[model samples]
Target: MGNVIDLGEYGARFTEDPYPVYAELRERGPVHWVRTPPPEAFEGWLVVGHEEARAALADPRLSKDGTKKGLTSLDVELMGPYLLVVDPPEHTRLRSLVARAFTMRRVEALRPRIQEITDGLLDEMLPRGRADLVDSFAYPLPITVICELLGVPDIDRVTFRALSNEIVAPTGGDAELAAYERLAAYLDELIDDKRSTAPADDLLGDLIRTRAEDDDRLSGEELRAMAFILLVAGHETTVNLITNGVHTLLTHPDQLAALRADMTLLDGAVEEVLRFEGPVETATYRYAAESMEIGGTAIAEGDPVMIGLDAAGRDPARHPDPHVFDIHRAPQGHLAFGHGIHYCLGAPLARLEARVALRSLLERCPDLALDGPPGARPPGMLIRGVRRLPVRW
Candidate 1:
């Protein structure tokens, strides 16, 4: 434990781009005890190597069942058990319940709708001459799309957005708890409304109907919790992905031009953006099921294991010239969406949204460039992206 490297020492620089420091740590070894950066500085065994992190993600011994490390457990039951909070059979059951809605064919069908949403947002965004893409484009696009697809209602999105933001990026106070309770109540009513109203075709309605058919398969609280996870998980990460994807392009002119030159590179460009500036700094927490060793580092029972997805993307051992941003680079095993069993169920949808959003923006805004500093990065390691990205043609 004394060998712990305090990431706090790296200051804001580390927050901007953690690869440099991650590289320093990876050079020493693949795994090491380290303190996460503030405002939630908790110590854990961090896995930085691409090889190790990819394997650790699939390793059954590293369990996902636990409270999130180092803060904010208020009214935990209010959120109920969802995919990220359980280990298999439970996780397997929960994931299978909703996985069908996000499969390849389902997501592929969303292309036209995603195109329409992006085009509508871009219509407003481009006409402004300059805009905080986060607010105008990236923020609204995914939230609107997720809400519509999940049957969350158009009018409720604004209210839900304000509340959901608090849950993810709170002021470190009761607001998160308040947001949690308020959102659950809101979703609860929404669920009850679905039950009472005409049977509709949407994810939430489907869940309710399925629950009605077989009460044992899904409980009341689990139904509500699944809505919370789907709505939040479906929305937030993609918002970061679109915003940062544009940020990546505007900053890297050479790569941007390469993509612009051959639009076929669009898919690879999105993959590269996810690889370079993954939406999350580190993947979610996993507890050691037993005393196990990962990457030659001993981890005790109940020890926390944090996998740096961003760090692994830049691991030279796995991807040569890891620091270089190349759209043409083969999509060799990037852990952006994740790997193994608990891999993001919403991945297909996230990719579709990003591809459509990025393509439409580039094709429309030919002169897009950063207008000012892309505001502050979102707090904590859970999500990695700026709060605002101002850009103009």
Candidate 2:
């Protein structure tokens, strides 16, 4: 209703762990504008409401393509034209290209392989007594799965994953930049391989032919960036989801017991984790195209908007008594995967991975619990998750 709050003092550390600030802001209102720190050369608004965020994500008024507005940066330089950053026409066209590969039939087809991979990871991890769920199991499983899907040669995975990790790391240092360049170059070459060799199976091969079929729809850079986005976004977020879901369940004994008692609750359990402790913490930045009002807050045209999906899910107005984690809570829509056309493209795959990962862990290690104090968490607002969820039977 009034001017948004200025929460600049907290800085990068706040982005790492913003729950306290988010709680305070929720008490104030749903939509609040945040003033960027000086010399950064940008101002942005942060929306902390579930309803407002959903609207903003779906609203045609917000421009996903910053380049149309002359917005450019080094991040976009190596990343290239990802669908998440482009609006309809281009967005519709590009997304449709890969949409076929995500059907339930296709996803189900991966079940056998998913089980094998999950079991293999757990087999190695179970013997270690106490292992970081993230590094040991959660991260590698999805990475390998997506790599297989993309036809990424096993030899390239270690180097490529290192790059992907840096791109999404909390601290985007020179290492992160270097990783992007390495990945972009790698993808450039990989795309070339798909063109010439004509690999017989996997999504990469399919996408290559699809591009050939619709040659005018995508360019060399566009194709490479699309592959990069799918590979990185597909694997990274799911890793966070699986790791965070397990941590939340272990910390909340009742929920864990309920899920363990009845595996049928697994689906709801995954959604609950996403709602209560999902991975993505903040909006990926959207630009307001024209003067707009959301949740009674006025936003001028061209204003940069960052929706705090972390805060939105816990908004008390939408989910009364939002802080308390309830596993059996009715599955209400959450911004964990985002909303609108830019919603997570890998949602199905991520959901499948989490469902399998959580279910398998519970069944295999019914005694699974946190290996340390209940306070260990990752250090970033963008990807709220645990760094190491040590578990022991």
Candidate 3:
């Protein structure tokens, strides 16, 4: 904790691939005080080692709701009480309510529809023979699936995408705050519209209109918060998963060949993609609600901690020769969707979407390859992905 590591020294190289830097930090220690590189240009503690990271993810001492700042009362009113922010009883309550509505049945039922969505995207993109996979396939498939599943219609996804980008990987302070404000207002509007209508069918509608046996139901703020997280998290991470999965395979010709040789490897390939280059680089920021120590580094109350998930995935202690990406290897504990109580609820759906998208794309376009160097990595540590993934079938 004493020696401050300046991540800014690594700059774009770090953003392009932070695994090497993370490995170096782990060699030194499990945690350190570091100034994060741009777009997340701020100072915080970063946890890099696998065991420490896994423990830190579930540690109640490092609270998700610590010093959440830059919000007006109204902003908090509209957006507070979501799963990622508040811990326990509240998180437990909200999660239970959401879980009751967002059941595994919903996820399982979507397989046919998800396949159709994938087919539709491939039908359009394949004819072009070359396309920016992000725009044509990766982005559209999940966005369409989630929007349709949630019954959101006519959304300006291009604008939504911009706002979502800033929320996870911002250029500066104002943009991140503004993005949250705008999305909150937008989600609140949708909730209001859904509330006014009766016999509501979609997930948001159910959250707004459904009531329990004891008259328990989500309040307005809870409704918006739930909708907001679902809308943002639902598609954002999955887009990267699909894009990164394809990009990883095409670049690693041998792995790609292995998968093609045996389609059973598809599932393991998805897990490997998560391990090698998962969508989330750092888990969302957690703060110390009380004095604590993570991997022997002291953290006073309110200090921010960023868990390096990608780094943990590559931890040699957990996975042998962690640098090597092998589809055949068992990839169970990689933390791509994260671990503990805050584990991704939408993970099943995300995995479902990715498996469908990748298998369909590969099956149809037998000769997919990198159309050019993949686009620049998105500017921040929270999300680990490229903006444009150019590919040709």
Candidate 4:
């Protein structure tokens, strides 16, 4: 193991802005055993180099099934056997089942609705002249879209948001677990209600009824887990995608002006936002199924491995002048959405939401600007972006 870097000691500052620290570490080596922040404090191997990160992401030896290795950070028993934690045939089967319902056509069909949601949110937000962009716009846009996509009731969205946020960025152990339990219970009831009623034309309903070519059907527990991951993971990262995209644009005037001048650059701008400050700071834990070497560092079997998505995106080796924000910069190979099979299934939806959200907001409120320094930094290194983003127009 390499020297242990005490991340817990860095506290809020580290969580707030870990890029500089990661850049320093990448210079030293591609991998390091570092103590994670509190609330789930433990040491693990963190891969930071761009090539190493890409290699580690596709490496079969790094198992996503932490349950087999007795890793508790992402306990399958608590979260259920979702696609994120399963390997090979199981992963393939789960993804194929969900893919039937979560098709590109379905996501493309959401563009108009996504724009409508963005427009409505901006209509209310622009009138205020100032608002916490996160609460007023960023959070609502994607949460509403995901809820509507899953056929979840609008009344339940606020509660779902609280639970989803907690699970993604936990404040305390008991609170986090409690939140998960509440969400799981809610999903169980929701799924049961869907099963009891005639099926509706929604993702959840489709999942409830979807069957494989082999005539395989999702079990009760699998259904609950699917609903849980879809509702939470579906929108949580998207919330950050919009928030981080706007935050990046607002901070970099040159880039913001370039985007505003030519709306056509919106797509490229969104990609840059993802590459620069993506929703996920690190890919979820992947345990070493067997001894492996990453960037010349030996990882023992059962050791936890983290792919630094944020760090990899900014590696000077991959992106020249890596720190500068350039919307037109080719972001073709960035691992913002990850690299391999486990790459985000929601990438298309996220990209759509961000494009609509950014274009609509900027067009509607020409004078939009930061209201205050980025609000309280969200706690946890796994997900990045401020808890509240104050903005004005």
**What digit string (tens of lDDT, one per residue) describes model 2 on residues 1-393?**
345455558775554456678878767777666664322324578888888888888888898778887877555688678787888898888888888888777898898899899999989989777877877899888888887887765437677767776666534456556777888888887787667775558777877776677566776667777888888887668988998788778778987887778888889888888888778877786888899888777788888788888788888777777877887787577889887788787788888888888888888896787868533443333567755666777
Instruction: Kindly report which residue stretches of model 1 are placed more than 4 angstroms away from their true locations once superposed.
Output: 67-76
Over 105-174, each residue of candidate 3 has an lDDT whose tens digit, in order, gives: 8788999999998988888888878989999999988889888887876788888888887776777777
Give all TM-scores, in the order shown: 0.94, 0.91, 0.94, 0.95
Error of 2 at 323 (Å): 0.8
User: Which candidate do you rate higher for TM-score, 2 or 4?
Assistant: 4
* Model 4 misplaced regions, further than 4 Å: 70-75, 210-216
- Across residues 1-393, which tens digit of lDDT does each residue of candidate 4 receive? 557888988767788778888998999999999988887776789989999999999998988876676665533665578878888878897888777555578789988888888888888878767989888989888778777887876347777888888888888889887988888877767777777878578777777776322355665566677777887777768888888888889899898888888999999988888888888998986888998899788899988899999998899999887888898896557888888889888888888888888889888878888877887765666787877888888
On residues 1-393, what C-alpha lDDT tens digit does candidate 1 reach at each position?
467778889998888878888898899999999887766577888889998999999998887766534432443478777777778788878788888888999889889888988888888777779988888989888888887887866447778888877776665556767888899899888888788877678887788887787656787878888888888887779999998898888889999988888999899888888888889778886878888898777889878899999899899888889998888887667898789998888888999988888888889989888988889776677788888898898
Give, for candidate 3, the lowest lDDT window spanning 10 residues: 66-75
All candidates in order of lDDT, best leading: 1, 4, 3, 2
Write down the lDDT of every candidate, Cα atoms only.
0.83, 0.77, 0.82, 0.82
**Deviation from native of the Cα of residue 307 in model 2, angstroms:** 1.4
Q: Which model, 2 or 3, shows the larger TM-score?
A: 3
Give candidate 2's whole-model lDDT: 0.77
